[PDB]
């Protein structure tokens, strides 16, 4: 289609409305209620443009550019006097009841309403009467609520209900007394409530964690990074001020995490700002604790390493690719051990084998929203990989989108989309040990142990293609449900199969792979998705190594007299007693970490590593996409005593000092080239982000905005002489505003969104080729592997039916979004949010034990008689005990294990 704006001819996409058709070309129209992902509702009436149907038309009509399709031959005027006066009047009407709260507002300089008040040129107030006020609700530890600043643009209710699926936020009130919130006070229990701080154009829903230690947007030092709290790897923009991480903002990735994060990744950053964190290298002689800087620590570590017969290294799925590779090259290829256990590594290797060898195209997170029928086997997505659950909700609403598009309704008429599709939605079949958070839209939910879920998957795979291995012994009711799932999946056009290593079983992944292979054999565009546990689980599995049991038995047998533990707590993947014995037995433990782990008492040397905010690196998400996360700040700028370096830098300098007795602090590009040289299958991480020599017309990229303040006074308490700003030799960014952050620069890594006249999170519209689509000049991060030409065979080893053995209790994993991450539970803001540790029991088994809810049951696992209060789970199957993974003293390695001595105490 071809449109005419003010006499200028523009080629646009005719399936789009006029608002983002003009926003794609760079034409500024004020707007509040429209969002690129939600749709158009025509509420705020701010997007008015004067439309003409002929080339010679004087009057025209003031039409809504978010509600008028951009067909071929529309002559719209934006800067006309009538349209500008009406837009100014709408801004004025929104400004009649707005409070005088801008200095004391958390979105000052980040406000969409401020940008559209200055954009329309409204600065004179002739309203003289009183302003309406509203009370505020306590929405929990995350969201600060201030309803006086609202403009009734209906974005919060639209996102939270029609997009996030939440049920506790709604619109109440009257004519002008419109309220947006809960029917009472209490925590917003949705797992995607954190995006309300950027969906809301005003300062109603604000980040309370940021509001504790608050600084303005221009005071933030930003960086592009990857969220480390689970395996999805959503792109984030960490921003710091005064040496502590202040706020995690959303970063636009058109393929992964376009406009929405989750609460664990958005509010779980509080572990970085802990004072218990090691900031200097600390060495122990017996009970004496001394502090060294980098050089003497490196020389002493190299001396003790040379005085040992075999140095072993225990990596972690939390650390980056470069740091794990540095440990591997420091300790040797054969002596490198992955920090995960044997079962977790087996499930991870199977998931990687299905991904990069199964011949089935695994889709990205943006591509999930277009799949028709979704089968989730084993994985509790909403509490582990929550963004995949949100994309699953979008793919479910795709059916109503399809019926709406069949009735000649444009895609941006979202109200008509839910109008036509009242309750009809795509099939979703979830399996878990209990009820999930996806049960509101799921076509079926199977509450069963992992053996029965795996057998259900094998039954689906056999009933699709008869060459698949059959399971015998299914009840006819479950057989009818199997037939229903088969009819739903076979009749679809883009089936999706979602599994992962969080189910605690291998046969679940085998069954999901067999279902995907059977769907592929019938001639369908089937996709698969394995959700891993940690952020860099996939990269550690790709690199490989031994299990934690092998490292512990090397330490216990005496063949390893020196162990380097890289960013691992070692109690999350093994028992605490065995780890403590194997570490006290070893005469040298060197823990390189940025967190005060429990094993640092046994550590002979502690090396203060850097977290994601203070280190550069590459992480591989759950779909094989290599992504580079950059440094936000130099920790030594404010606290000059702080010797806190990148873990790969620590290990590479230790390797160099061990070899040639010289200390050589390397660069990130050298380590990246070493990875892509020694490991052929990690060669794609060179293309994840360009090197430190990349310039936009000769200059670097700025980490802080052009109006960064207090350069000559933020360090004046220590010394009045402002030092040289830190130099980033590793990456292409600089710790200064002398850099390029234009929206039209030929780059993919964007630290923050800012345009002249666009200060809100809506400033991301200028950084894309089309608004709501991919990022301009391509999205960052590349896939490590392609789809194979041929796939795997049928996994024949079906499991047996779950028969509850007396005495032994199978442990059913109950993952929580707030508490199952190793680092997110260390945040002090999650302690007021995470639930209490409850052991979950069937009513029948609790009645057999005689225990009621509330009382304490003690259970012993490897000499640890730990007591937990009891919650009753009706959906849990008999013979199991429900345990929360990742909590205090309950490791995720407990999944699938037995539990003897379960008595009331």
Partner 1 sequence: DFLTEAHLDLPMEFESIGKAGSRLGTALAMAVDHEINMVSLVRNLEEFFARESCGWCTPCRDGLPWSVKILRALERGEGQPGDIETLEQLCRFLGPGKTFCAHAPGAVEPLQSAIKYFREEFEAGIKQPFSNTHLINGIQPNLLK
Partner 2 sequence: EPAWQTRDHLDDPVIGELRNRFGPDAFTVQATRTGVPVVWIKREQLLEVGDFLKKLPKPYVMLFDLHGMDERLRTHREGLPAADFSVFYHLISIDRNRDIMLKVALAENDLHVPTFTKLFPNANWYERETWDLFGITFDGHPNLRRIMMPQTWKGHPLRKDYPARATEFSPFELTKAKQDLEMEALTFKPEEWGMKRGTENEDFMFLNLGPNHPSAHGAFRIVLQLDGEEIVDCVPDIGYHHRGAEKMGERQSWHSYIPYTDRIEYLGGCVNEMPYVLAVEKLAGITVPDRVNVIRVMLSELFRINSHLLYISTFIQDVGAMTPVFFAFTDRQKIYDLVEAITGFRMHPAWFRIGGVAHDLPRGWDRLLREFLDWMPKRLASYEKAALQNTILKGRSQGVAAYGAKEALEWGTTGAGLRATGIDFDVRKARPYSGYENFDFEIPVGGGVSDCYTRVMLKVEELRQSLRILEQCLNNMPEGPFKADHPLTTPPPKERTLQHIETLITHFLQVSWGPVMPANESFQMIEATKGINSYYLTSDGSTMSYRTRIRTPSYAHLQQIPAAIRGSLVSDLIVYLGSIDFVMSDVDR
Interface ranges with partner 2 (CB under 8 A)? 91-92, 95, 98-100, 102-103, 108-109, 111, 113-115, 117-118, 121-125, 216, 218, 695, 697-699, 706-707, 711-712, 721-725, 736, 738, 740, 742, 744, 756-757, 759
- Cα separation, 722 vs 716, whole angstroms: 7
Interface residue with ligand FES, options 34, 650, 752, 758 (CB under 6 A): 34
State the residue for tokens 């000649």: 408
Q: Which residues of 283-297 are buried (b: 16+ CB within 10 A; e: fewer)?
A: bbeeeeeeebebeeb
Q: Shortest gap between Cβ of 60 and ligand SF4 (angstroms)?
A: 21
Interface residue with partner 1, options 72, 79, 121, 127 (CB under 8 A): 127
- Cα separation, 262 vs 248, whole angstroms: 11
Burial of 549 (0-12, 13-18, 19+ CB in 10 A): middle
Interface residue with ligand FES, options 21, 22, 24, 31 (CB under 6 A): 31
Residue 46 touches ligand FES, criterion: CB under 6 A: yes
Q: Shortest gap between Cβ of 754 and ligand FES (angstroms)?
A: 22
Half-sphere exposure of 205 (CA within 13 A, CB side): 27
- With helix as H, strand as E and coil as C, how does 2-25 read? EEEECCEEEECCCCCEHHHHHHHC
User: Total residues at the site for Ca ion (CB under 5 A)?
Assistant: 3
3-state secondary structure of 732: coil
- DSSP state letter for 876: S
Binding mask 203-242 for ligand SF4 (x = CB under 6 A): xx----------------------x-xx-xxx--------
Binding partner at 156 among ligand SF4, partner 2, Ca ion, none, C-beta below 5 to 8 Å by kind: ligand SF4
Binding mask 62-101 for ligand FES (x = CB under 6 A): --x-x-----------------------------------
Q: Shortest gap between Cβ of 259 and partner 1 (angstroms)?
A: 24
Please say which residue, 83 or 588, places its beta carbon nearer to partner 1: 83
Please say which residue, 135 or 175, places its beta carbon nearer to partner 1: 175
- Cα separation, 451 vs 457, whole angstroms: 10
Residue 437 touches ligand SF4, criterion: CB under 6 A: no
- Tokens at residue 165, please? 């699926």
- Cα separation, 621 vs 231, whole angstroms: 5
For 353, residues 6+ apart whose C-beta sits below 8 A from its C-beta are 792
Closest residue to ligand SF4 in the complex (CB): 265
* Residue 355: other Cβ atoms inside 10 A: 25
Q: Within 630-659, which residues bind Ca ion (CB under 5 A)?
A: 631
Interface residue with ligand SF4, options 35, 149, 426, 840 (CB under 6 A): 149
- Tokens at residue 468, please? 């698949």
User: Total residues at the site for partner 1 (CB under 8 A)?
Assistant: 31
Q: Shortest gap between Cβ of 101 and ligand FES (angstroms)?
A: 23
Closest residue to ligand FES in the complex (CB): 66
- Tokens at residue 291, please? 């502090």
Phi, psi of 162, deg, nearest 5:
-80, -15
Q: Shortest gap between Cβ of 161 and partner 1 (angstroms)?
A: 16
For 613, residues 6+ apart whose C-beta sits below 8 A from its C-beta are 223, 225, 238, 240, 245, 269, 272, 631, 632, 633
| Alpha carbon of residue 552 to chain centroid | 32
Interface residue with ligand FES, options 21, 22, 32, 510 (CB under 6 A): 32
- DSSP state letter for 704: S
Interface residue with ligand FES, options 12, 44, 169, 410 (CB under 6 A): 44
Q: Within 596-635, which residues bind Ca ion (CB under 5 A)?
A: 616, 631
Q: Within 248-287, which residues bind ligand SF4 (CB under 6 A)?
A: 261-262, 264-265
User: Total residues at the site for ligand SF4 (CB under 6 A)?
Assistant: 38
Residue 387 touches ligand SF4, criterion: CB under 6 A: yes
- Tokens at residue 352, please? 């990687």
- Cα separation, 53 vs 63, whole angstroms: 12
- Cα separation, 379 vs 450, whole angstroms: 10
Q: Shortest gap between Cβ of 178 and partner 1 (angstroms)?
A: 5
- Cα separation, 816 vs 884, whole angstroms: 7
Q: Terminus-to-terminus CA distance in the chain, angstroms?
A: 74
Residue 866 touches ligand FES, criterion: CB under 6 A: no
Residue 107 touches ligand SF4, criterion: CB under 6 A: yes
Binding partner at 227 among ligand SF4, partner 1, ligand FES, none, C-beta below 5 to 8 Å by kind: ligand SF4
Q: Shortest gap between Cβ of 174 and partner 1 (angstroms)?
A: 6
Strand order in the sheet with 374-376: 444-447, 428-432, 374-376, 496-500, 527-531
Residue 322 touches Ca ion, criterion: CB under 5 A: no
Binding partner at 34 among ligand SF4, partner 1, ligand FES, none, C-beta below 5 to 8 Å by kind: ligand FES
Please say which residue, 35 or 393, places its beta carbon nearer to ligand FES: 35
Q: Shortest gap between Cβ of 75 and partner 2 (angstroms)?
A: 21
Please say which residue, 201 or 265, places its beta carbon nearer to ligand FES: 201
Q: Shortest gap between Cβ of 59 and partner 1 (angstroms)?
A: 12
Contact (CB, 8 A) for 598 and 574:
no
- Tokens at residue 125, please? 């107030």
User: Total residues at the site for ligand FES (CB under 6 A)?
Assistant: 12
- Cα separation, 164 vs 183, whole angstroms: 18
Please say which residue, 645 or 873, places its beta carbon nearer to Ca ion: 645
For 27, residues 6+ apart whose C-beta sits below 8 A from its C-beta are 5, 78
Please say which residue, 36 or 270, places its beta carbon nearer to ligand FES: 36
State the residue for tokens 């440094």: 631
Contact (CB, 8 A) for 886 and 822:
yes
Half-sphere exposure of 90 (CA within 13 A, CB side): 24
State the residue for tokens 């006086």: 148
Looking at 61-69, 109-117, 441-449, 452-460, which segment touches partner 1 (CB under 8 A)?
61-69
* Residue 212: other Cβ atoms inside 10 A: 12
- DSSP state letter for 699: B
Contact (CB, 8 A) for 821 and 264:
yes
For 769, residues 6+ apart whose C-beta sits below 8 A from its C-beta are 24, 775, 776, 777
Interface residue with ligand FES, options 42, 69, 469, 875 (CB under 6 A): 42
Binding mask 70-109 for partner 1 (x = CB under 8 A): ---------------xx--xx--xx-xx------------
Residue 245 touches ligand SF4, criterion: CB under 6 A: no
Q: Shortest gap between Cβ of 233 and ligand SF4 (angstroms)?
A: 5
Binding partner at 113 among Ca ion, partner 2, ligand FES, none, C-beta below 5 to 8 Å by kind: partner 2
- Cα separation, 81 vs 647, whole angstroms: 60
Residue 119 touches ligand SF4, criterion: CB under 6 A: no
Q: Shortest gap between Cβ of 618 and partner 2 (angstroms)?
A: 27
- Cα separation, 624 vs 360, whole angstroms: 13
| Maximum separation of any 2 CA atoms in the chain, in Å | 92
Residue 44 touches partner 1, criterion: CB under 8 A: yes
For partner 1, the binding residues (CB under 8 A) are 42-46, 48, 61-63, 85-86, 89-90, 93-94, 96-97, 125-129, 151-152, 154, 173-178
For ligand FES, the binding residues (CB under 6 A) are 31-34, 42-47, 64, 66
For ligand SF4, the binding residues (CB under 6 A) are 98-99, 101-102, 105, 107-108, 111, 113-114, 149-156, 180, 199-204, 227, 229-230, 232-234, 261-262, 264-265, 385-387
For Ca ion, the binding residues (CB under 5 A) are 616, 631, 730
């Amino acid at each position: 289609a071809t449109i005419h704006v003010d006499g200028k001819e523009y080629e646009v996409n005719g399936a789009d409305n006029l608002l983002e058709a003009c926003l794609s070309l760079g034409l500024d129209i004020p707007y509040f209620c429209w969002h690129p992902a939600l749709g158009s509702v025509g509420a705020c009436r701010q997007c008015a443009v004067k439309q003409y149907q002929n080339a010679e038309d004087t009057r025209g009509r003031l039409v809504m550019s978010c509600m008028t399709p951009a067909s071929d031959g529309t002559f719209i005027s934006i800067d006309d006097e009538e349209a500008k006066q009406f837009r100014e009047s709408v801004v004025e009407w929104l400004m009649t009841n707005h409070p005088h709260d801008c200095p004391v507002c958390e979105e000052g300089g980040n406000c969409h309403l401020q940008d559209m008040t200055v954009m329309t040129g409204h600065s004179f107030r002739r309203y003289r009467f009183t302003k309406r006020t509203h009370r505020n609700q306590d929405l929990g530890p995350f969201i600060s609520h201030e309803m006086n600043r609202c403009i009734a643009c209906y974005r919060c209710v639209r996102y939270y209900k029609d997009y996030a699926g939440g049920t506790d936020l709604g619109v109440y009130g009257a004519h002008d007394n419109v309220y947006f919130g809960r029917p009472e006070d209490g925590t917003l229990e949705s797992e995607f409530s954190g995006n309300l701080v950027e969906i809301c154009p005003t300062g109603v829903f604000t980040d309370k964690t940021h509001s504790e230690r608050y600084n303005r947007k221009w005071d933030m030092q930003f960086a592009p990074s990857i969220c480390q709290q689970c395996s999805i790897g959503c792109n984030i923009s960490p921003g710091e001020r005064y040496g502590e991480l202040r706020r995690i903002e959303n970063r636009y990735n058109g393929t992964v995490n376009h406009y929405f994060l989750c609460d664990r990744g958005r509010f779980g950053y509080g572990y970085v700002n802990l004072k218990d964190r090691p900031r200097q290298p600390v060495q122990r002689r017996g009970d004496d604790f001394i502090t060294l800087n980098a050089e003497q620590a490196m020389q002493g570590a190299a001396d003790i390493l040379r005085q040992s017969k075999k140095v072993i290294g225990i990596g972690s799925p939390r650390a980056s690719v470069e740091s794990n590779f540095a440990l591997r090259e420091l300790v040797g290829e054969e002596n490198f051990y992955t920090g995960i256990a044997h079962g977790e590594q087996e499930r991870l290797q199977l998931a990687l084998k299905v991904l990069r060898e199964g011949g089935i195209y695994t889709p990205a997170l943006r591509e999930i929203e277009s799949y028709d029928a979704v089968l989730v086997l084993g994985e509790d997505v909403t509490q582990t990989g929550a963004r995949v659950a949100l994309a699953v909700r979008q793919a479910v609403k795709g059916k109503a989108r399809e019926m709406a598009a069949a009735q000649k309704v444009a895609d941006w008429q979202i109200a008509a989309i839910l109008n036509i599709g009242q309750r009809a939605k795509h099939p979703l079949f979830v399996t878990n040990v209990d009820d999930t958070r996806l049960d509101d839209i799921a076509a079926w939910t199977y509450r069963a142990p992992v053996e029965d879920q795996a057998r259900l998957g094998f039954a689906i795979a056999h009933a699709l293609d008869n060459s698949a291995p059959a399971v015998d012994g299914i009840e006819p009711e479950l057989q009818s449900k199997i037939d229903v799932i088969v009819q739903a999946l076979a009749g679809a056009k883009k089936p999706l199969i979602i599994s992962g290593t969080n189910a605690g079983s291998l046969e679940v992944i085998q069954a999901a792979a067999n279902v995907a292979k059977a769907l592929k054999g019938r001639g369908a565009d089937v996709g698969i998705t394995m959700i891993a546990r940690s952020v860099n689980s996939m990269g550690l599995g790709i690199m490989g190594g031994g299990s934690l049991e092998e490292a512990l038995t090397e330490l216990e047998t005496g063949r390893a007299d020196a162990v380097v533990v890289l960013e691992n707590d070692l109690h999350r993947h093994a028992s605490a007693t065995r780890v403590n014995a194997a570490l006290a037995k070893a005469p040298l433990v060197m823990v390189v970490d940025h967190q005060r782990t429990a094993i640092m008492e046994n550590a002979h040397l502690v090396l203060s590593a850097a977290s994601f905010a203070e280190s550069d690196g590459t992480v591989i998400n759950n779909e094989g996409r290599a992504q580079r996360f950059f440094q936000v700040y130099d920790p030594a700028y404010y606290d000059s005593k702080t010797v806190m370096l990148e873990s790969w830098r620590w290990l590479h300098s230790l390797h160099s000092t061990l070899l040639s007795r010289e200390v050589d602090w390397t660069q990130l590009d050298h380590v990246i080239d070493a990875v892509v040289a020694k490991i052929p299958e990690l060669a794609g991480i060179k293309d994840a982000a360009p090197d430190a020599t990349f310039r936009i017309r000769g200059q670097k990229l700025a980490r802080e905005p052009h109006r960064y303040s207090g350069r000559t006074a933020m360090r004046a308490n220590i010394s009045v002489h402002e030092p040289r700003q830190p130099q980033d030799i590793d990456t292409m960014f600089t710790f200064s505003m002398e850099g390029n952050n234009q929206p039209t620069a030929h780059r993919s890594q964007v630290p923050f969104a800012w345009a002249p006249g666009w200060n809100s999170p809506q400033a991301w519209n200028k950084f894309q080729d089309e608004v709501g689509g991919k990022l301009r000049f391509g999205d960052p991060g590349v896939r490590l592997f392609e789809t194979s030409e041929n796939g795997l065979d049928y996994f024949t080893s079906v499991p047996a039916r779950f028969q509850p053995q007396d005495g032994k209790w199978r442990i059913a994993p109950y993952y929580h979004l707030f508490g199952s991450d190793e680092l997110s539970q260390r945040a002090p803001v999650f302690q007021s949010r995470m639930p209490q540790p409850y052991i979950k029991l069937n009513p029948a088994d609790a009645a057999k034990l005689g225990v009621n809810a509330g009382t304490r049951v003690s259970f012993s696992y490897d000499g640890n008689t730990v007591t937990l209060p009891v919650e009753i789970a009706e959906g849990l199957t008999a013979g199991q005990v429900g345990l929360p993974m990742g909590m205090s003293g309950i490791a995720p390695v407990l999944a699938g294990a037995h539990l003897e001595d379960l008595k009331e105490a």
